[PDB]
């Protein structure tokens, strides 16, 4: 669809470090260049190099090819929120089930929302998944370490954002509604969701889910969506024309002092007047979910595949 701040990365050496950038726009310019999945792959699976070469994040493979929230460059994926500190894409475990559907063959990284959070799978350097995804066989097309972005697969239609934390009573109220709505479900991804005197084995479960910032997610069938825009400082990226993201020192000056160029919308809330320029991020805004008479701004809203267990009694 196009990037937020920075065009696709053109890396030189796989051994080059990952300079961690605190500046928000700088953190999003890494996200545009998949420097975050690059880090995760390194931090969690002996991966030497980067993902996203030439293509960038705008080229990551999404399992639901009909991915709606991907067309919006500014809607954050699970991984993209891992870089900003909203969710940790936990490394997989022998018990974290890989969902069927995605063409895993050749993937270097892939990720899926799980009922209790987010889980990713990495392959080591010069390695790539099998068609089932549970091993990392050899792949001569991965020796470079400067791998394409198609080698990154993000499972599910997912949108992440700053969440209004909800009283825990709400969550439990929501979990109670999710249980009356989904009585057949006994477990989701290994997390108890109801009680059954007879449970069938794990089963693919395409479900609209929601992260309200609590233990598990709130899975949904009858729910309403609606998008907003707070025009807050996190919905605006800052950049120096031609030279990429503005420094952290320049950004705060832009988004506080108001002595910076910018789009209409920035100007109309922050101010304007060689210099730094800030703009809006490409997104409908913040997703608000109506559910069981209550609306909640989720940390992440989305429709994704999960492995769940249904009753037999």
């Amino acid at each position: 669809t196009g990037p937020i701040i920075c065009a696709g990365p053109i890396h030189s050496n796989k051994s080059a470090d990952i300079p961690h950038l605190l500046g928000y726009s700088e953190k999003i310019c890494q996200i545009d260049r998949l420097i975050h999945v690059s880090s995760w792959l390194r931090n969690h699976s002996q991966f030497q190099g980067y993902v996203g070469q030439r293509g960038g994040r705008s080229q990551v493979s999404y399992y639901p090819a009909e991915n709606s929230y991907s067309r919006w460059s500014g809607l954050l994926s699970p991984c993209d929120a891992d870089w900003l500190g909203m969710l940790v894409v936990k490394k997989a475990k022998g018990s974290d089930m890989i969902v069927p559907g995605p063409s895993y063959k050749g993937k270097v990284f892939f990720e899926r929302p799980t009922f209790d959070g987010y889980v990713g799978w990495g392959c080591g350097s010069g390695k790539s998944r099998t068609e089932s995804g549970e091993l990392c066989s050899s792949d001569s097309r991965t020796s470079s370490g400067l791998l394409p972005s198609d080698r990154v697969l993000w499972i599910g239609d997912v949108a992440c954002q700053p969440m209004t934390p909800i009283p825990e009573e709400t969550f439990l109220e929501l979990k109670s509604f999710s249980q009356s709505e989904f009585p057949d479900i006994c477990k989701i991804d290994g997390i108890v969701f109801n009680q059954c005197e007879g449970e069938s084995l794990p089963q693919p479960f395409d479900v609209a889910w929601m992260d309200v910032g609590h233990s598990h997610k709130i899975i949904m069938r009858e729910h309403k969506t609606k998008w907003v825009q707070e025009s807050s400082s996190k919905d605006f990226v800052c950049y120096k024309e031609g030279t990429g993201p503005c420094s952290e020192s320049e950004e705060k000056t832009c988004k506080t002092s108001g002595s910076c160029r910018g789009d209409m919308q920035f100007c109309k809330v922050a101010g304007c007047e060689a210099k730094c320029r800030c703009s809006l991020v490409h997104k409908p805004g913040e997703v608000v979910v109506s559910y069981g008479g209550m609306r909640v701004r989720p940390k992440c809203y989305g429709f994704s595949r999960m492995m769940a267990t249904l009753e037999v009694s």
Partner: antibody
Amino acid sequence: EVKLVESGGGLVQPGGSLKLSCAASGFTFSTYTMSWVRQTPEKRLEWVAYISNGGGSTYYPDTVKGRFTISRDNAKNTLYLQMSSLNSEDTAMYYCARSYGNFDVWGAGTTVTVSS
Amino acid sequence: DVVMTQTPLSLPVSFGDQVSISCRSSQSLANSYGNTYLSWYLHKPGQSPQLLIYGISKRFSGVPDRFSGSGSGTDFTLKISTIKPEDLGMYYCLQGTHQPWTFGGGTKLEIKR
């Protein structure tokens, strides 16, 4: 009570087409993956087609891949198997089933006889 | 694909007998999570296939305690501790751990005389 009732079975001509409809009642259709199973006259059961709950994923064995198309409208809580390129080897009682390695609820079946 | 071979194909049975139905798979029906999606179905004449056992040994509810499954790996077995007339029919084993899912050859429980 969990009830699946298939419909659309009858005589078809070789190479012709027939679509089977599975009407689902007594459960939350959209939270179950579903599948179609046939029984040849020699009483052999065969897995025919599978579909996720949201219809996004389908699977077939190469015996009926590209010839059949499974589909489901959760809105009407109905499962569908569009059968094309039919042959006398497609002579069977086609059952629809609540699915994923455990066909825990089956339909009454619908006889599809491919014969010129 | 995963060839499910069912022994016996025909099994003469008398009421009160305990009968065994063995199903041996070409490959290991243990996936990479230890989950084995092998299920046993009963198909009585003129009715629909009914799920008896799923997941090797877990009884579908509505199925009497006389039906029991067991096994691991390649060879799996269905066990009816006490045959009753309502159990006669064709019994099928079925994988689901690997695609394509494959049923077994079938076991006709017929009356021994």
